[model samples]
Target: DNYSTYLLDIEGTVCPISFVKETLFPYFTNKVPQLVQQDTRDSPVSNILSQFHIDNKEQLQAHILELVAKDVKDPILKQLQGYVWAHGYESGQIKAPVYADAIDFIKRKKRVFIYSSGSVKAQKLLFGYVQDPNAPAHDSLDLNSYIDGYFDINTSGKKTETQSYANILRDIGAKASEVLFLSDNPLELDAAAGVGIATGLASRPGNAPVPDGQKYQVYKNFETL
Candidate 1:
């Protein structure tokens, strides 16, 4: 129980990988036409176009759909999807189905932190507007309430790089060994381990298969921590 600093991954680790693939991405992709207004300044649409240098409306919409279908971790499309998903989250349309133990992980003695390639805002949205249809009274799961802090590509750099873990330790006020980084990705776990952080392969159900997971200590879920 000494590992109080728990850095988590989104998508496959906490929420089912299918939720993003089947729900969030489709929601964003469906709104592509609405998101592609004349492409002006200071708008989310323009910001996405400017970020990716998208010119033709056809190319913009086409590429957006293509990215969603291909499921690339591209930042421009991810950020745009995050914004579009916010409407879903805020309106109670999109509710992330987090693993039950993920809820417990935050409620316990551990100080939970999120480290996802998605923008911090997107991560917040996922945790902030969660939905457990099984829970009562439209009981949404706001895991962010139990979370301590969040990190994303903006501050932590790339998940596959060691420097990002170093930066995270520096920012989170913990030494490398004092914090435990749990993720389903082999490369991210390897990156954290390279920096001397206690790393665990979060072997959640339906997580993308990590052939390398067997090499490291693995946690089947938050309870295993």
Candidate 2:
């Protein structure tokens, strides 16, 4: 019951949902035309191009735009978006906004990992270039040092599936009971709990309303952790 290892969710759990919707998403969308022209012989970009059968740059950009508009969860799309975000984050064009409480939690915890639908690259970018929500103009927090590891759909599986949680447990070499998974989604919490991992609901602002009568511990802020 020590719960030394913590698995954190990105969007709506540590960072505000608006940062993804208004900042990260738009940054990628705006770079679609430029990103489409990059060479894609054997890269994540190449995988997407081949999967969509895209030959021309214009067509590739359009398809990416469509996927973004639909808010698709395709792995290829996520990988490509992370590629674009890498440029934005490194160039100081996009800095992630993380909640103050979440920052404190990571600061105090020795084993903090992120598990999200977002690519692992994207997860690292956000944490590596994190800024305080209250001080948006400040320097990056660089919490990557404090964090232990990262997991995404590729490493685990789908967020809503119990087997994915099991995969993470096995990969981390930690017993299910030793890890605590936190998310704004009840289904994801249920999935983690199904594998005997501790679970909590992160009821942050702009997150979807949790259905009534849930048994999971709902924490409005990470300070409670």
Candidate 3:
């Protein structure tokens, strides 16, 4: 009601925060070679492997899994992760467990943007597959339909820095006062708040409880907002 733009994190903002750690990471870790063998259209998965010469699939897979656990944001890793996620999503095997009314909650009226460390491609893949009940394709909550844009480290600067929010505001051509940034990370909320953007902490299932000294408004689910 107060902001024109809304920035959301992928893992904790829209779904049970455990999804990334429990579902996606494991899914991608296992489906790597299969995705590569199938989608031969010069994807991020291939781009990463092409640049770095590694003959052993086991070694590469092991390293990539470690990166996922470490939550590294290497552009290549993000891109590959996005590519694999695309396959999982399109196959109807992947569905983000969003709120009952999360899709309808945001509505197209609000200018929504994804602000995550993951690549923009990955962001689009996750949301695009979120087919809603009214969606022409499937009967699932497709919040991606309402999203207007995406921001990542490659384009939006670092997520923890105040300047990142400033950069995104500049790119959106919107004032910081008009953007409401929602995330599970308190430091991220602090950064966006420092930049004069409206801020909220997403208290989704499996997300760590915010510390007591935090100053951000809390939203348990999108529809209730």
Candidate 4:
């Protein structure tokens, strides 16, 4: 009854999984040409590409696209994608779709934190440009206003690692018993549960069906929580 902190996963927990797979990834891939040719002087993009041994920019572009297509979790690729997505978000070309009830939970909850594989910058971008399903085109809400904090793999470690959840509890200065973590991935739920945090399995549309006999409680919307 006293769960003061609500920890959430982004991709399939709070939003449709397809939004990232169908919308954001394509947006970044479409800008590959410009990304490769941009001036590299002291740039993060340049720094990312430098990690690769390839000397030719054209070859590097092909390699980057290959990584995106495979959905590789390379930190460098994710960082680059965050930069490109920032431009799209700022230009109003990208509007992140969050579940209506999820938005409401953020509004009502005392403390809400986002923990995703996406970078902190990407997390802020997505929340900063949320699209209302019933609103007219180009209208979006900055959900970032309601969020207490953000954590990504860079800050919290892998989502499947129990230590990650422990680190988050320590960082937030909250008791593990009082924090509730919600995610679509059962493995992630297992990790959080290991550290004494409550876990919820989000069953969003287009998400892979959850296997039977999981210990975590499954819910389709935040209202059920």
lDDT of 2 by residue, 1-225 (tens): 268799999888998888877887888888877657776588766776676667887877888899999988777787677777877788878888888899999999878889988778778878899875667776667898898899988899999999999898887888888898989888889888888999888988888888898788889997767
Q: What is the TM-score (0 to 1) of candidate 2?
A: 0.86
Q: What is the lDDT of candidate 2?
A: 0.84
Off by over 4 Å in 1: 35-59, 70-76, 210-213
Candidate rank order under lDDT? 4, 2, 1, 3
Highest-TM-score candidate: 4
- C-alpha RMSD of candidate 1: 3.0
Point out the worst 10-residue segment of candidate 2 by lDDT.
44-53
Q: Point out where model 2 deviates above 4 Å.
A: 34-52, 74-76
Please give, for residues 100-155, the per-residue lDDT of candidate 3 as tens digits.
Answer: 55566567447888888767877777676664545435654556668889998889
Instruction: State how far residue 29 of model 2 sits from its true place (Å).
Output: 1.5
Judge candidate 4 against the unseen true structure and give its global Cα lDDT, from 0 to 1.
Answer: 0.87
TM-scores for all predictions: 0.84, 0.86, 0.82, 0.90
